[PDB]
């Protein structure tokens, strides 16, 4: 207990200001695009409770920007050229066509990822059998969902595969992946 | 105090058997190693420039003479000439390193603390030693002097029950650990075991062993060594090739490490010195004065190494300067004569350290040879197996 005055049973871990803006309100944690104007859940709440849509817009766009997204660096003053090309030097029609193509591609990518996740759950259910040796052909829906939402680091899935193949225990899962902060160096980037 | 009060005739025949110049008298408990500092005159703590500059520039001149002699005939020299130059340079550097160890404890030039800390860092660098880790380990030594399971920054002896535990844990004396222990504590490479101490500094290169308000100082302490082995060690190789490295650096390194290891090993090891765990009969003044040894040198070596063997005059007085360490000893024998212990340079002493005094037993509270101990604890394994057949 390095703390002289107060030391609760849980050690204090410092909190720091966030470095990136949160996911919007509309996007899923997955790879599939969103409904592109109105989320589907907006239909199951009272009209007087859906001010959170436009409020979240006002927040991400103007009001709570984390002071780490307004850092002037040598990298951002060239990304400015790129973005200004895209926003002022291109006609909106070509931008629209590229938008449609990108949406289609991302939908196909999501379908592929979902198939891969299902195959992964089969393989892990199969390997836990060799692991525990006996009856369990089971997997965990927890791990399937965590794989579909990109919540595991690779080390976590490796440790989980080993734990399954050696002791079964299909309900013992790695803790969670924590969010990646925004890299900064100096005036450089 | 292990072979305490009995007629002085048998302690003298023991001193002649072991090469010792004396064996101590009886010391009673309840004392402070700082007590006897009240005896020394008030001029033994004096400061003067000439003695210090001599103590720093004489081994410097020794090293410089050795290098000049070598670079005069860089690699065409035979083997024993090379050995002579290596020994000379290593001795000069042992002297400079004792000056370093002086300014690390802040008792070299207290007038300029910054200049003296910089001097200590600069002079410790070529040996790859960090000043603050050294200071921490030396204070941690002084505090636990000759205590069991507690002084690991000195020559902690290997005991019996632990070796039997490892004997069972390895499933015989044929594992790597037992063979390593044997080969390290049986051959003259023991006289270089200080090298291992150098690898126990850099405490995993881990700041989680220290006090946070000290981090920025500890890291800078690890900087001067690293920077050296990052800048100078390449240059030498670049300009000298592999052999030209085994000559101008590695050999004086092994010389200095020999000097260090033998100084410590002979200063705090002896068969008439027990190693008690505290609670089971430990005491500060006792394990300080009674469990110690002081070694004798030729006055050339004593002016070179800069009084590197007088460890007690500055264990009773941690603030005693270096050019006064002999004189203070002159006073101490006047008062605690019968309790002191002394010894001299002799290959017989080293040979007994190598072959006779190898394993410490707490029952007889003394050191025994390793092959006899190993056969006898194999015999005790036979005993416990005989108690285990049924």
């Amino acid at each position: 207990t390095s703390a002289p005055f107060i030391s609760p049973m849980t050690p204090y871990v410092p909190e720091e200001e966030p470095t990136r803006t949160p996911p919007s309100i509309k996007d899923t944690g997955t790879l599939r695009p969103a409904s592109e104007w109105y989320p589907q859940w907006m239909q199951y709440r009272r009209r007087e409770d859906n001010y959170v849509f436009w409020q979240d817009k006002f927040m991400r766009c103007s009001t709570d920007i984390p002071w780490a997204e307004k850092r002037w660096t040598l990298f951002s003053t060239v990304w400015y050229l790129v973005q200004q090309l895209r926003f002022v030097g291109t006609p909106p029609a070509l931008r629209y066509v590229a938008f449609l193509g990108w949406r289609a591609l991302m939908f196909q990518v999501y379908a592929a990822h979902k198939a891969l996740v299902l195959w992964q759950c089969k393989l892990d259910a199969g390997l836990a059998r060799i692991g525990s040796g006996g009856a369990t052909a089971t997997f965990s829906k927890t791990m399937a969902l965590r794989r579909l939402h990109w919540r595991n680091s690779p080390l976590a899935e490796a440790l989980y595969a080993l734990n399954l193949y050696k002791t079964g225990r299909v309900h013992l899962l790695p803790p969670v992946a924590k969010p990646i902060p925004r890299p900064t160096f100096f005036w450089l980037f | 105090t292990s072979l305490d009060g009995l007629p002085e005739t048998q302690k003298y025949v023991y001193a002649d058997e072991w090469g010792f110049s004396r064996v101590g008298a009886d010391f009673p408990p309840g004392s402070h190693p700082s007590l006897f500092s009240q005896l020394l005159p008030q001029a033994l703590f004096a400061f003067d420039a000439r003695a210090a500059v001599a103590a720093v520039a004489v081994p410097l001149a020794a090293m410089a003479a050795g290098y000049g002699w070598l670079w005069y005939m860089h690699s065409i020299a035979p083997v024993w000439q090379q050995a002579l130059c290596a020994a000379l340079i290593g001795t000069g550097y042992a002297g400079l390193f004792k000056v370093a160890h002086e300014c690390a404890m802040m008792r070299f030039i207290p007038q300029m603390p910054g200049l003296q800390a910089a001097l200590g860092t600069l002079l410790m660098a070529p040996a790859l030693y960090s000043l603050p880790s050294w200071r921490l380990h030396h204070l941690h030594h002084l505090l636990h002097t000759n205590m069991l399971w507690q002084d690991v920054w000195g020559w902690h002896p290997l005991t019996k029950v632990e070796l039997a535990d490892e004997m069972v844990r390895s499933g015989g004396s044929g594992g790597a650990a037992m063979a390593a222990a044997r080969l390290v504590l049986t051959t003259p490479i023991k006289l270089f075991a200080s090298v291992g101490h150098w690898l126990r500094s850099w405490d995993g290169l881990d700041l989680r062993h220290f006090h946070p308000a000290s981090y920025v100082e500890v890291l800078s302490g690890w900087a001067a060594p690293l920077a050296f082995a990052g800048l100078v060690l390449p240059a030498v190789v670049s300009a000298g090739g592999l052999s030209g490295f085994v000559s101008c650096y590695l050999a004086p390194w092994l010389v200095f490490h020999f000097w260090l290891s033998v100084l410590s090993l002979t200063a705090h090891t002896a068969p008439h010195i027990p190693w008690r765990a505290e609670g089971d009969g430990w005491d500060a003044g006792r394990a300080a004065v009674a469990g110690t040894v002081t070694l004798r040198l030729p006055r050339p070596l004593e002016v070179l190494l800069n009084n590197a063997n007088y460890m007690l005059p500055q264990a009773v007085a941690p603030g005693l300067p270096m050019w006064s360490a002999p004189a203070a000893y002159a006073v101490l024998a006047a008062r605690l004569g019968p309790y002191l212990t002394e010894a001299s340079m002799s290959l017989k002493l080293l040979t007994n350290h190598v072959t006779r005094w190898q394993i410490y037993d707490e029952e007889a509270h003394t050191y025994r040879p390793m092959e006899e101990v190993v056969d006898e604890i194999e015999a005790d394994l036979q005993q416990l197996a005989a108690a285990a057949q049924q």
Binding site: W72, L159, F185 | L205, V216, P234, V237, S238, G241
Partner: protein
């Protein structure tokens, strides 16, 4: 290894940076390869580069042993800088001891050590390098145009050379 009472022992907060044993491992590998190759050939560049890289990465992996403090952040900074410089020198100037007679074969490509250094920079960036975020280029008179404070804006204008412009604001 393995611990059947908790298999996920690495994914636990011990207080140090995750990419910490990789930094020291790479420093050791760099110094060893430097010495080996520069003695087995006779060139003086590989050992100097290898020992400098090893020393700086060892110091970085020391300061990375307390990730909460400020040294724990300057450590990752120094480590990223050194591995990036390694990748740069390799893929843009190549290695002196790898010169040949031809001119298209002695051209700089990306070999093993560059790939390892690049993996290191990527792993540093994907873990945590978000520290010391208040060091950037100073703000313009273009960032304080709509700021709600007059003393700050006057300060910025004065610095950038516009102290005389009238603040009709």
């Amino acid at each position: 290894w393995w611990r059947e009472d908790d298999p996920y022992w690495p994914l636990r907060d011990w207080g140090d940076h995750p990419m910490r044993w990789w930094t020291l491992a790479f420093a050791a590998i760099m110094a060893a390869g430097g010495l080996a190759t520069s003695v087995a050939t006779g060139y003086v560049e590989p050992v100097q580069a290898g020992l400098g890289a090893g020393a700086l990465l060892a110091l970085a992996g020391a300061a990375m042993s307390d990730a909460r403090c400020v040294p724990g952040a300057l450590g990752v900074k120094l480590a990223w800088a050194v591995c990036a410089l390694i990748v740069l020198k390799e893929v843009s100037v190549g290695w002196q001891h790898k010169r040949k007679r031809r001119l298209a074969a002695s051209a700089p490509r990306l070999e093993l050590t560059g790939l390892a250094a690049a993996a290191l920079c990527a792993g540093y960036m994907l873990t945590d390098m978000s520290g010391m975020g208040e060091v950037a280029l100073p703000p313009n008179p273009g960032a304080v145009f709509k700021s709600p404070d007059v003393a700050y804006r006057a300060s910025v204008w004065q610095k950038w050379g516009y102290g005389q412009v009238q603040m009709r604001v």
